[PDB]
Paper text:
In the ATP-bound state, the NBD and SBD are docked against each other and the SBD adopts an open conformation, allowing fast exchange of substrates. Nucleotide exchange resets the cycle and triggers substrate release.
Overlay of the [name](NBD) structure with the Hsp70(NBD) and [name](NBD) structures revealed root-mean-squared deviations (RMSD) of 0.769 Å and 0.734 Å over the Cα alignment, respectively. Moreover, in each structure, Ca2+ was identified in the nucleotide- binding cleft, where it formed contacts to both phosphate groups (α and β) of the nucleotide as well as indirect contacts to protein residues via several water molecules (inset). The NBD structures also revealed a second, surface-exposed Ca2+ ion that is coordinated by the carboxyl group of D257 and backbone carbonyl of H252 in [name] and homologous residues in the cytosolic Hsp70s. Ca2+ binding to this second site is likely an experimental artefact favoured by the high [Ca2+] in the crystallisation solution and crystal packing. However, the IC50 values for Ca2+-dependent inhibition of MABA-ADP release from the NBDs of Hsp70 (444.7 ± 80.5 µM) and [name] (345.5 ± 71.1 µM) were much higher than from the NBD of [name] (57.1 ± 7.4 µM). Given that concentrations of Ca2+ in the cytoplasm are in the nanomolar range, these results imply that the effect of Ca2+ on ADP binding to cytoplasmic Hsp70s has limited physiological relevance.
Residue numbers in the entry: 5 to 384
The structure:
């Protein structure tokens, strides 16, 4: 049994094509996505939810955003810029970046592909827990703009995890494969992939013909994601708590974290409901924080970030030399594309054109990866 693994910036997802359909596999916590987090404590190494859940208690030894480091050199401008936003240490080992942590009392360093191997190990175990069988063969996805060094380092992460990586394929290709846009009766198809995750915004235009997924353009923002929408909600409620209780909770890591968690949950709920409850017992000094937020307020807090996602779409179209009327298919992927206002903005931008969004947007890449894995293994 060959699996498809979406190794995302903030979440990872594993699917298997069996008996004519994709099954996206829930972890032992019942979650169909797993945080791309690894934590190092005085006793153990944690991966996924367990790692993310203890981040506020152990910030310096909790590693994330390994995908931003993978296949890069220490001196790279992107690495030096990104280090300013991480509580964990990034050190230079002979021109290569390593994350340095405390683990079982000792100072330890790990290459990005070692951190990612631990996430892939977790995704491997999630598939094996469900299938009741050893999982070796996998297709793993990377962004279209990833170079050979980034692709090789991602593949090596799989190998370190004991996975046989059949192929590294582009995330926008996986999304297009999921919706079967390569198997439509016709000539070429122009496809725009609108991919908004937790940390990154990726716009891709492919022209698909004779099984060739030609990248015509890429655009977006490597630092725009769902976490920015969460940030706007947290600042909103910190100001609110300040007004009501004359308490600034900003420098209480635990308090801010629990507010952030509640804010992300509320955001997810606002994609299906016009209102959401914030319910935190003893947020700060035993003071309960029970309030609500309307969809309207959430949209208002994030108005500039939401409509700003259309500028990269325009750029991608210009660089691809296509009018919006020449796009055959629009594909929503990444967890953030569930936000109704984002969906409305993109559909309005494409003058009413229906969006491909029937596949759970945060599962579509793993879905495509799993289809490709079955094809390569000869089980489809
Ligand atoms: N129903 C939802 N409504 C709004 N945002 C959501 C929803 N489900 C997930 N998200 C957001 O999607 C982001 C994760 O996107 P995903 O593609 O799964 O991860 P990655 O960041 O690794 O690409 C998070 O910010 C999460 O809060
Ligand atoms: Ca950001
Ligand atoms: Ca994603």
């Amino acid at each position: 049994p060959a699996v498809g693994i979406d190794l995302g910036t903030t979440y990872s997802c594993v699917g298997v094509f069996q008996h004519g359909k994709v099954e996206i596999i829930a972890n032992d916590q019942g979650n169909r996505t797993t945080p791309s987090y690894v934590a190092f404590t005085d006793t153990e190494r944690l991966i996924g939810d367990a790692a993310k859940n203890q981040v506020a208690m152990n910030p310096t030894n909790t590693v994330f955003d390994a995908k931003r480091l993978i296949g890069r050199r220490f001196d790279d401008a992107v690495v030096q810029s990104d280090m300013k936003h991480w509580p964990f240490m990034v050190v230079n080992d002979a021109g290569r970046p390593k994350v340095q942590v405390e683990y079982k009392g000792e100072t330890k360093s790990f290459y990005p592909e070692e951190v990612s191997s631990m996430v892939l190990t977790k995704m491997k175990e999630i598939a094996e827990a469900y299938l009741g069988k050893t999982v070796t063969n996998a297709v793993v996805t990377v962004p279209a703009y990833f170079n050979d060094s980034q692709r090789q380092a991602t593949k090596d992460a799989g190998t370190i995890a004991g996975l046989n990586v059949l192929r590294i394929i582009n995330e926008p290709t996986a999304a297009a494969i999921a919706y079967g846009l390569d198997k439509k009766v016709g000539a070429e198809r122009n496809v725009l992939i609108f991919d908004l995750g937790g940390g990154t915004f990726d716009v891709s235009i492919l022209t698909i013909e004779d099984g060739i997924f030609e990248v015509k353009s890429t655009a977006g923002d490597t630092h725009l994601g769902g976490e920015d929408f969460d940030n706007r909600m947290v600042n909103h409620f910190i100001a609110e708590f300040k007004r009501k209780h004359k308490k600034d909770i900003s420098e209480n890591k635990r308090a801010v974290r629990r507010l952030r968690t509640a804010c992300e949950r509320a955001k997810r709920t606002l994609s299906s409901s016009t209102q959401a409850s914030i319910e935190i017992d003893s947020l700060y000094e035993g003071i309960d924080f029970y309030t609500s937020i309307t969809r309207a307020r959430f949209e208002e807090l994030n108005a500039d970030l939401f409509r700003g996602t259309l500028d990269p779409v325009e750029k991608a179209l210009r660089d691809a030399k296509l009018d919006k009327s020449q796009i055959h298919d629009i594909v929503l992927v990444g967890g953030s594309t569930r936000i109704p206002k984002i969906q409305k903005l993109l559909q309005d931008f494409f003058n009413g054109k229906e969006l491909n969004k029937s596949i759970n947007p945060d599962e579509a890449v793993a879905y495509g990866a799993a289809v490709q894995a079955a094809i390569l293994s000869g089980d489809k």
